[PDB]
Every structure is written in structure tokens, then in C-alpha cells.
């Protein structure tokens, strides 16, 4: 089952959560960086800091549940994110 | 060409609502991007040229995690 470092359920549209490695020594929370040619930090990586917990992020699945499950389809929103990035920032796919 | 990655420079993408889903994995749970063509894909992770552990499309190879609730 689905559930935070508290054992509790996952909220839907509603607490924040940090995203982090269960293995140690390899890399922090997931946060934001620019990569390549951008100048503007859109990239999703894990912080070079293993003390990181990176940057919050809420979870948006459309059915009307108060908390989110396995399998279930949803966006990610990173709640705190640069300026410079579109707002809400929601996590996508993109080639390169 | 290198691995499909992560972004939030989109602004095209729904704000409720997504491509992702979590799943169990091996001593926690990981992260999965459903595809355009009907084939859910691991997550996981590619140290790209400025060291960087970026969040990739890695089909078979994925980041295992945990999610901390702020506070």
C-alpha cells in the first residue's frame, strides 16, 4: 500500500510531500535544475546533496478521493519552483 | 539524442491530472510515466555531462523512493 515515511495515506490536492532515494549515499530529494543549454532551473533531478530533501511537490489525481493510491494516474505540481518556470509547475516528459 | 527526462517547462500540460502514477517497487515504491502508447514506463535515474542525477524515462531500471510529508 501507498503511504508516507509515517505510515499515513498520501493526501490528494493537499499536503505537500518530499520525493526521496530510499538508498543512501547516492543523491538528495528530487528538486529542480537547469541542464544543458536552459537558463531557467525546469529539469527534475535529484539534489547533488544527500542531506537534501529537494523541493515539495502536491499530488493532483482528478478522481474526487481524498488521498491517492498505487496505479492511480496524477500530476505532480512542484509547489516551490524558480521564478522563471510556468506556474503551477507540473512535472511532463520531454525528448532531450 | 539522449533519454526522454523530466521537465516542469511545459506549459502546455494539465494542472489536475497527469501522465504518472506510483507503483511498489522493491523495499519502496517508484515512479511511472504512462506513455502515448499504452505502456507504462520506470522513472530512474541518468547522471548526465554536468553531474547532474537527472529523472529519465529508464524502461526497467527505476528510482526507488519514499515520500516525506512536509512538516
Known sequence: RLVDTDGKPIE??????????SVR??????????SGGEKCPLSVVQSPSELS??????????????????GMLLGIEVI???????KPSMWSVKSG | ?????????????????????????????????????????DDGIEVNKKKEKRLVVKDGNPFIIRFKKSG
Not at chain 1, 516551490?80 to 510556468?86: K, V
Not at chain 2, 526522454?4 to 504518472?20: A, D, I, M
Open chain 1, 12 to 21: 490528494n490536492d493537499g499536503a505537500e510531500y518530499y520525493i526521496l532515494p
Open chain 1, 25 to 34: 549515499g547516492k543523491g538528495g530529494g528530487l528538486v529542480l535544475a537547469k
Open chain 1, 53 to 70: 530533501n529537494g523541493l515539495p511537490v502536491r499530488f493532483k489525481a482528478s478522481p474526487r478521493s481524498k488521498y491517492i493510491s498505487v
Open chain 1, 80 to 86: 516551490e519552483s524558480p521564478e522563471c518556470a510556468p
Open chain 2, 1 to 41: 539524442w539522449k533519454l526522454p527526462s523530466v521537465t516542469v517547462g511545459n506549459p502546455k500540460v494539465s494542472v489536475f491530472g497527469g501522465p504518472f502514477k506510483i507503483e511498489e517497487g522493491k523495499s519502496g515504491y517508484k515512479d511511472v510515466y504512462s506513455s502515448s502508447k499504452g505502456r507504462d514506463l
